[model samples]
Target: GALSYETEILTVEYGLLPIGKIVEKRIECTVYSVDNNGNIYTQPVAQWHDRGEQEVFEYCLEDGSLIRATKDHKFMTVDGQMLPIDEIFERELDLMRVDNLPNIKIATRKYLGKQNVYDIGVERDHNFALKNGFIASNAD
Candidate 1:
């Protein structure tokens, strides 16, 4: 339960590259993200964490974009509200959309037992976009 995400959740990092290499290499990196007002920018990755094993869930969005994460992992709504995965279904919400980021809605979710998981800290925005352009909050 402690681990926040599965290792392959791709981040829209600087140079527009996916973050699997950064996580695998354990090196510092910057990721592209949007602030509360939806201004696109970049922020340094404060840290990277790999927890041995933890409960995980796979959320498949209405757009068919998927993310594997802990129930507690936070994601940003289109209106800029930060909400965790467990509570997303409790409210009617639409995810943020930018140039490449698309409007998204949660469609389904399932418990995936335990898996090796990982997370990162964003130096400023505290948010990072997935490869599919879904924006999610970083661990504090």
Candidate 2:
């Protein structure tokens, strides 16, 4: 059997950006348990920015790596428009490039049911504009 799980993306906003604007992106994730009897049961969770939603897909393990279909899911716009998942991901990447600022940090946390916790840092490309010894703008 294969593992079954759900994932969520949370986009954290920071700095002087607008309330609806995204500053840093963090992923809080969890993975369930896998049995040795060819049974897999695990729930994985992650978070991205609020500017976009998440698209989940089934993946298969191969050669110690997971392979997923690029076209498994699609993105639904707020205006009732649907776009390909790849396109949406690309757009989000572009958005990050356009909105990234300096001195920003992205972090991830993982919980394994009990008190086990793992923390990781996410990398982002941020650009900073200084004016009069103060930060003015950041565009990745």
Candidate 3:
């Protein structure tokens, strides 16, 4: 696995774009995430298997950096080519130094003790630069 993701989400919402032709547009938002470590878990989490703040087979991870498309739409297929969106992430106030440093190992924990992606916002892009770290990683 080149870039593994601890969390991932694919959401589609029904909304209306201000521009676009006609009216309502069913927004298709699909985001791909990679954890600090390139660990990929293509299986359902044994724990946290509940409803709300989650869903069945959510395939969600505790913390992850994303590649989002829009507020509701995240993926697209332009012509015969598959178009991918650019990563746009924002950082908040947060610094992390957890004891779980070696939990995942060098191969699996390359992103664990990081000050950049491991401890930052969860609902944004993965290619974000360090502004000063995000406080939101505390919950992570």
Candidate 4:
């Protein structure tokens, strides 16, 4: 019942250093993340969720990075606003990051066909970075 990513989606991990497929990892694993103000840090995953066989879409950023998630998944924007992936369209916007936050545009979206997907809860900040370095909320 949680919003999630497909099995191959990569996230910035503490031990593995930017590994993909969080569903394949453990609860003890920590993740690299940032705050609403772009302050970077790491938090232990409070929980790992395997929400099987849900629909997902790929959000390709202009920075040449992509992330896949369910429509209900939430993301943090640079302006301190939380938006769902279902509402974001092709537009120039800034996505929060663990490194330097960048103003990137949504380049394209595609139906990648559903497989197993995953989600996680962070100990604090409730947000983490994808391998692409963009931050997304884990609270959902």
Candidate 5:
């Protein structure tokens, strides 16, 4: 048997307007794919930024739309159940960056693990020496 795969991508656009706060824009993503073994998989990327924090929500393929175009208020929960998605995410990111920017790998790995995907490791390195002479040294 030959392995075959197909993908469908969907983008969702929504806006958030909290009372006494500025309106912010947001987006969500839904991806559907099928594998060679007749198994179907669907993933939802639900995220929103509120008060300098990023929160994510996950749903099964059958109920992906349920999570779309949704909003959460402080002390509110999705599906009427109490959960700390925002707090947990903040904690995770904080722990990852506790050491330094290099620890971004940990955050990247966490997301990749949830999506069951591989990442091509690439890192950014800035060369200060190249710009040292171009600009006046701040030693003064």
Candidate 6:
């Protein structure tokens, strides 16, 4: 969430990934001397428990891409360039501005509330209609 906006994945549900940790389990370790030797292996005959607390919260930006971040201090690194991260974003906002696509309109709005939450009022916008006069459907 904190980094989703920076990368522009606006509709992501934040979740922490599982971190790796060390785990150990007891196993039979009776070494025999090939021919005949009553082994004296001092080891537990059974395991008591197997558990481990799961690494770091590497933030993810799921824009149809499997990328992770290594948040070190104020800097962030995705699966892409590790050196030119901040430089990459400085050139994205004005990205679609000069595009040659038809029927393209760009407008920037600012609000004081939550970043992801939209507080605009549209009296009666009457459903979100998509291209070609198609009606936005339910999960029917």
Best by lDDT: 1
Question: With candidate 2 superimposed using the best TM-score fit, by how many Å does residue 125's alpha carbon deviate from the native?
Answer: 38
State every prediction's TM-score relative to the real structure: 0.80, 0.19, 0.15, 0.77, 0.16, 0.15
What lDDT tens digits, residue by residue, belong to model 1 across residues 20-93? 45555776666767876688787777777666677888877787767787888788786677788667745757
Model 2 lDDT tens row, 32-129? 22122312232332322332232323322111222111232332322222334344344442111112222211121122221111111222211111
Candidate 6 on 1-140: residue-level lDDT in tens? 11121222111122221111001212222110100121111211121122222111222122322222112112211211112212323333211111122221112222223222111111122111111111111111
* Better structure of 2 and 6 per lDDT: 2
Which clashing pairs does model 4 show? Answer: 10-20
TM-score of 3: 0.15
Candidate 5 — which residues are off by over 4 angstroms?
1-22, 25-49, 61-63, 66-140
Candidate RMSDs in Å, in order, are 3.1, 19.3, 18.1, 3.3, 21.8, 24.3
The better candidate by TM-score, 3 or 4, is 4
Candidate 3 weakest ten by summed lDDT: 102-111
* lDDT value, residue 105 of candidate 5: 9
Q: Go through the candidates in order and give the clash count of each.
A: 0, 7, 10, 1, 0, 1
Question: lDDT scores for all predictions?
Answer: 0.67, 0.23, 0.19, 0.62, 0.19, 0.18
Q: TM-score: which is higher, 2 or 4?
A: 4
- Ranked by TM-score, the better of candidates 2 and 5 is 2
